UniProtKB/Swiss-Prot annotation:
One of its GO terms (cellular component) is cytoplasm. The lineage of its organism: Eukaryota, Metazoa, Chordata, Craniata, Vertebrata. K(+) 2 binds at residues 9, 11, 14. Residues 91-100 are annotated as: DNA-binding. This is DNA polymerase beta. Its EC number is 2.7.7.7, 4.2.99.-, 4.2.99.18. It catalyses: DNA(n) + a 2'-deoxyribonucleoside 5'-triphosphate = DNA(n+1) + diphosphate; a 5'-end 2'-deoxyribose-2'-deoxyribonucleotide-DNA = (2E,4S)-4-hydroxypenten-2-al-5-phosphate + a 5'-end 5'-phospho-2'-deoxyribonucleoside-DNA + H(+); 2'-deoxyribonucleotide-(2'-deoxyribose 5'-phosphate)-2'-deoxyribonucleotide-DNA = a 3'-end 2'-deoxyribonucleotide-(2,3-dehydro-2,3-deoxyribose 5'-phosphate)-DNA + a 5'-end 5'-phospho-2'-deoxyribonucleoside-DNA + H(+). Residues 239-252 form a flexible loop which appears to affect the polymerase fidelity. A 2'-deoxyribonucleoside 5'-triphosphate binds at residues 57, 88, 91, 97-98. Its cofactor is Mg(2+). The chain holds residues 93 to 335 of 335 of the full protein. It comes from Mus musculus (Mouse).
Amino acid sequence: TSSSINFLTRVTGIGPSAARKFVDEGIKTLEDLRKNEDKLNHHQRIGLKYFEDFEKRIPREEMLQMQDIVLNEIKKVDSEYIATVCGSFRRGAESSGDMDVLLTHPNFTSESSKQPKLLHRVVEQLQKVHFITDTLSKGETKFMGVCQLPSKEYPHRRIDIRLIPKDQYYCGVLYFTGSDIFNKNMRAHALEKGFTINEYTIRPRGRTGVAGEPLPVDSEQDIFDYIQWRYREPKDRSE
C-alpha cells in the first residue's frame, strides 16, 4: 500500500525503491522491519534502531552543547581545522532536525591531493570521547552518523560531517546555512549582477553565457561583496 511505502521512507536508509521492495515482501511496519533485520543494510539497521529518537526535534540549548563539544574536540586534533555547524541552527533557530558540520583545513584545497584522513581523524576523536555513537555511512569527504550528549539519557541525534576544500569552504557554509528561499533570492541577485553562485564557487558569467574561473573567497562577506549586497547575518536569512 502507498501509505506503507511512505511510512517506511521515514526510516533513514530506506528510499522509495527500497520501501516498495519491502512492502512487496509484506514488510510494512517498524515491528515488521525489526523482525527482519537480516533484510536490512547497516544504514537501515541503525536508522531503525533510533527511529523514534531521530524524529524528535533538537532543542537549541542541546545544539549549543553539541556544537561546543564538537568544536572543542576538533581543536584538540588540530588547531588549524575550521568547523561550522550550519543549517537552521546557524540562523539562530530554537530547534533543529539534525546537526550538520562543515569542516575544512588549509592543507586541503580543490587542487591538492585527496585527504580523507582529515575527516577520519575528527570522526575518530569524536568516537573516542563517546560523542559519536554509530556510523550510518562514511566516505572520504562525508560522514553520516549518530551522536549523543553525555547524560536520564538524551536522545540519539543525527550528525553529518563534511570535509570541504578550503577554497570552497565559505560558499559551502553559505549554501548549507540557507534558508532555501534566501539562497534562491541570493542566486537570482547574483545572476542580475553577472555571477553564478553554487555550493562550491562564485564565478562571473559573461554576456555570452560563458563562465569564468572561480573568484577567491575568504569569508561569506567576500561573496556578498562580489554581488554588492550588504552582509546579512545568518539570523536575517529567512528570506
